[PDB]
Amino acid sequence: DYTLTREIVTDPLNVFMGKLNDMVNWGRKNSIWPYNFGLSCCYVEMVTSFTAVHDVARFGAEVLRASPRQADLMVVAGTCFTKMAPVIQRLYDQMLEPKWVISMGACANSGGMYDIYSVVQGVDKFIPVDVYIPGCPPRPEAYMQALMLLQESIGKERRPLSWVVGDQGVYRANMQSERERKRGERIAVTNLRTPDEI
Amino acid sequence: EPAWQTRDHLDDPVIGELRNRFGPDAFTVQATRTGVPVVWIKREQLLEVGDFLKKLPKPYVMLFDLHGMDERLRTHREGLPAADFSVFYHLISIDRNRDIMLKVALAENDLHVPTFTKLFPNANWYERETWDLFGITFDGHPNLRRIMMPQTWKGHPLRKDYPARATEFSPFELTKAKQDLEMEALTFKPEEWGMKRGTNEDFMFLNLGPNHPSAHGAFRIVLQLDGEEIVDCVPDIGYHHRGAEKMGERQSWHSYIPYTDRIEYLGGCVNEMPYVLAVEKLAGITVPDRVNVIRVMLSELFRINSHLLYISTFIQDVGAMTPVFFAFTDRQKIYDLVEAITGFRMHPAWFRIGGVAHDLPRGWDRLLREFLDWMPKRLASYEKAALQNTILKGRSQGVAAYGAKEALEWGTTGAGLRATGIDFDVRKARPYSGYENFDFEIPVGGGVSDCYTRVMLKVEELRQSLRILEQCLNNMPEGPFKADHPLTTPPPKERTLQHIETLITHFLQVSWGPVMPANESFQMIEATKGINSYYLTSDGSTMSYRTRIRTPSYAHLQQIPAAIRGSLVSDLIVYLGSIDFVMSDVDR
Amino acid sequence: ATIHVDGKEYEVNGADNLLEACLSLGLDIPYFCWHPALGSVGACRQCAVKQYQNAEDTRGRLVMSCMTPASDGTFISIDDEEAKQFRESVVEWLMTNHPHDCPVCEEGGNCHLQDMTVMTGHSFRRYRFTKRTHRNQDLGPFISHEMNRCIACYRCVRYYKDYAGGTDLGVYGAHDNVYFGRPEDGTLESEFSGNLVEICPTGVFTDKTHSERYNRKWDMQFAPSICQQCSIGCNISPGERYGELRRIENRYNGTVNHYFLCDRGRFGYGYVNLKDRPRQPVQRRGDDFITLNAEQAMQGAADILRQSKKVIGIGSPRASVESNFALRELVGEENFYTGIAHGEQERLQLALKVLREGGIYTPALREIESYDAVLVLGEDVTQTGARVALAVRQAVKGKAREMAAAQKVADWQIAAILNIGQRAKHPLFVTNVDDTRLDDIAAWTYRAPVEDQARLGFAIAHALDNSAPAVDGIEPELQSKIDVIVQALAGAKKPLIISGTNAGSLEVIQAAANVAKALKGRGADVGITMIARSVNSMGLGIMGGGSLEEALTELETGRADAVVVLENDLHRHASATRVNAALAKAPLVMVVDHQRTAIMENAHLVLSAASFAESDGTVINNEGRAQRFFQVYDPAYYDSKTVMLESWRWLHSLHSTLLSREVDWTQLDHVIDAVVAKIPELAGIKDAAPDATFRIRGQKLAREPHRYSGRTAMRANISVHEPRQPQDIDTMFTFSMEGNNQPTAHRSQVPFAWAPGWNSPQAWNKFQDEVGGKLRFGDPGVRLFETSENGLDYFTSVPARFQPQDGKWRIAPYYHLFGSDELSQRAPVFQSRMPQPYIKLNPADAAKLGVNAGTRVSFSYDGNTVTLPVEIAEGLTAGQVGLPMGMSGIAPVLAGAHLEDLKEA
């Protein structure tokens, strides 16, 4: 099951262009450069993930280009203020295809605790979001888990190989949600450690 | 007499001096729980009173705060002049170790006060923020534009009739705002920003923002330049405004604590402490000693965390990108201890009215002992790696220097004020949370506040915080982690779980909110980045009638133009790296 | 009087006790057993203050502020250490046995005991022993019983027995085993038993209908509305959660219905939450029922109405003033027909003429309790206007009040007043076709047909004033009772005459008017009260129009090819066969309604109108007071497909689309201005509530409390994006907590009472100028008319006595508080409470027909034979058969009609 952007369609995938699509998706997902965009405390945990104690460099996501042209992924990590929302939209428009968006934190997800006059209630109001991370702030390993989720999201999506041959629309897989996938093991939890110890 | 008792402070010599100078009927003394004398002055005598306080034998030299209050919905105003709005001016005399809160009452139609900038230059941004959020006009202001909201914003958000919650989103507003973002570079007029003689034609205009590649936040600075020399500059702030005061008017006294966390998001419990202290002043709560030492422990841990991040970011801004990894590993050790104690990393939300959310977990002293053994070798390694380097010294020494007069007139606190040679720390001058029982030193500078002097003072403050943490680990009382007061929110959990009166208190405190009686309270503490303060006005309800958060990064950002005038852009970058500010602290 | 509380001087009323005087000053004293409407007994021992003998005194003495008069030169202290310690100790003694029940108790967040436990500062438990336990009782479908939570404050017994006159609730047991409840399991028989849930400061008595779908007070969306279940017009606070009407609380009005509702108004709201209600406009095409939005429905209805040659409109007394006026504007003044029958309209217009042209002051509901003698003629008040019956009970106890006041006993010392006035009471004379619920306190009861009750009234008026027409044919025993009534009424300082349109006789209203005029001619302070039937019966009478029979005649004759029925089921005012035939002959039937009625099967177009919880409007109660009710919630907030609008909005948009072929919905103030501009009789409805631009220091009025929760999750199952907050352009209220609900706010419409520290219904004490008095800035509602300068003439149409004719049976109306109102039977909680449909037979007539009690008899009315079981009625006069009005199959129009071939089936 896939979704078009130029519509809910099926999988269109001879065998040579199939292997080409898997190789292109593998190269895209194994080399994702985030854009260095500092908004709020969620970016502090993002750069905490960037340091040596968590090693986001292992996933090939450590180049951290200061220009949106050289970046493939926008990590909106912070509150979406009304003054900063045109800046976010302009920086998103400056990025080039393929582009993916990770919302980091409850502010970027939905506005979070700041349902206030000067905060846009979520970055999905004006730019599309690929991965959402709950948390305030999400811990750095949660950001790396969201990076892995984006990696398997990219790994089966279909994009044109060239701009002159083939269908130019972009396919995005309707993935099974992590909630229903993890419900089998989350409900079975019965006992946890008592909060009186270290 | 307890520290939270309502005092009129009529025995203060400033009251006698004001009575001798202006007369007994010239002002009204208000009894509060702020700890400072609150004096209601007539509007036409405001500048005279300010000048008289400025020319005292031990003068009031620093305008600590200046803001407004919407008094239209305040039912309990006994012993107060008739006011639709009010403007308050908090002034600190370091020589007396005293402070006074002047208050000017304004009617709804005549919402204008004389400007205070001819006495204190920080009144520029303070009055701009008062006009932006309350609509109060200050006559004689050089440029009274909106500082928090954009210029094309209708209404004033901190007024009581303004809706707090978010309005519906429209892509049309975003698209047109993208159009003004596009033509802002083309249609830039220096007269709008207060600059003069723009484009002689030897000056160019430079915009650094909106997004900087750093962790201090997102903001803009427009610079008037002759080649590489800065002649005029004003910072464009308000890009991080979250409506924290307006949120304080729509959350209960207990449910506002996570919002107090995110004021200075590198501070955490340091930001939680003045709020819960002021609420406990309103509630008449004296916390036990174990609560004091626990709060001191967590505040010093988060102070060390913030100082480590600040030193790392300053070193990275100089150009050395290596020690930030090791210092973030040290921050991970601190976060391990904080996760063990409070259950969270950055915003613990652990301080409570009357105590803390839980008792200390079994084994906290082990993690504290390992952290205290781990820290000093890493600190010496960072010192020898970067802060004794000659390139860093050449980049940092003598850059954006100011003296004691400039720090006093601009409200600069924290590392800069102590680097100017003035010994003023709230943990010693006006002690709080049982800080008198800890033996620690206050580092001061030679008299000139460079980047290097401020960074070394922060390193010495980290050393003293390690000393305080050692004293916390060695000497901790065994006792309650919550007060024995009926207004302790929430009550202890086991008594809630098996006693019905405690269950009733818990039920009504977590649902409707705890009822603070009608009073004004004020708590001023030494934050990780300067002096922080919470000014809370209660009307007798379960929410705050007015929450006023004074943060030092506002004063530092306003002192930015007065100190970098005549310097280079790289000097501006080093200065921005050496302030220890966050944009959430400025814009709140 | 001059008192000194905590060293501060205050001026108070010397006739008040110290508790109500200090609560009126804003001072906080905890209290349980005292109520403003019930007086002081000194039971709970919670209100202890420290009194001093004079200005210089340090010892003092703990006195009981509810039992201590606020005399001149009093010196008391509330914040004294011994007083505070004793109040905390009293709270602690109450909390020794209290169950650990707050999470699973319906009084949580609304509990006076919780508020006073917190306010005294008691939060530490040192009691370590057991807690006493009580079994519960089944009290019926409305009140849920939990005796463990009792604090033995005696409010329930005092209200239910001394105030409401009930007989089935009492206190039993002993020292600490005191049990408050019924002597056995069973339904609480009183018609005002629902006020126990607000009288009880704990969760012993709880709203069971609210408990079925329970939510806390902070989670409610409240509005100030008017109860729509009879003509009294009691002020209510409907509270909503998750798109359904959850509770009806009593909203304080110091002029009408101060602390108390009746059970029909408190538990009869369940028709709002019915799942068969129309939520979208529906057009019938052949056999299909297609669904339109608002614009296509307006365009299609306007097109079909434009092709019609004459469109008539049938209003209803269910609908508000604005809806009836909008229908009248759409169809024309000469084509507007009131939805009631000719006889009902004639009785309503006569009662209106007596009220606003008879020169006798009609009292408000609170003012009824100060009259010295009461004569109820024809009306069964407890089953039709129940709150008037409660006020009549208070007026009857006024004699004991006067007797105790003559002995210098304070008016709040209720036990001494009841001890002095043992059984002496003000005269109450009730007339009905059978026994009433006021008979336990009535000085005399007259069980007679409506003609005989009218003759009794005419004879009373003739004996009071000889110029009144006389009645010939009075028995000597009846004449003795007549002169007893006349001697009681003539010696009364403030006589009150209560009648209404529910008796089904014009002559009863004429006789009551004659009695009131005769008492006015003797210089007495006479008042007259007329009880109407529906919520806006007075408004439809004032606006006026043709009867339903004329509309059916126009539909049958073919002169009207389009009928617009507004909020009417058309079966309570006419025979069902005639209505069905007339509506089937009409080529267009268009029903604007919020309840699924039986006339929608033939309706060509159905407009999903709004009920009172989803609409704004004005209703005129029985005393002629215009009152605005406000929308509680947006029905389209949760279900975005729901297109349910106000009836006046629907009809104004239809008029605009018929005239200019364009859609304009309205604003509410525009319709109010149109009403006050075109109908000068209804010109007083403008001052019922301020317009939508009214603000309190620039901000609107909050519908929901400031701690309203779940804002980002209550609609998250539909969509994760939070929708727009609903905009209320019609009124001054906002559908959010971003508003003003301060007790000191200069307003009269209060959606709900809450003060910090007062979460219970005792926050109304903070919302009043003095406790137990009016609201601080006046009560909402404005009387439409003043009393006339000159009265009417005597009604000379004296009827003859009732003659039982052979083969015919006069239908005596029997009314029930649960069953007679149209909208209340739709509430599913009422079917457990409504009585079984009976037919009342006199023992002589039942013996003549050979029928026992319980056997089924079949009678044909309008050629329709229905069967009912027989109940033997001793007090029913022979030749009459008693039918329960307003039930299923028995229209209220059948009162006074004759019955044929009544025979056992």
Ligand code: SF4
């Ligand atoms: S979600 Fe929380 S941590 Fe992240 S930006 Fe918002 S306030 Fe900061």
Ligand code: SF4
């Ligand atoms: S009656 Fe009041 S105190 Fe008792 S369980 Fe219910 S809410 Fe709690």
Ligand code: SF4
């Ligand atoms: S049942 Fe309620 S009203 Fe009655 S005595 Fe007990 S607490 Fe009071």
Ligand code: SF4
């Ligand atoms: S007396 Fe009438 S108006 Fe009042 S609550 Fe009862 S049904 Fe409603």
Ligand code: FES
């Ligand atoms: S309120 Fe006075 S003793 Fe109960």
Ligand SMILES: [Ca+2]
């Ligand atoms: Ca409306």
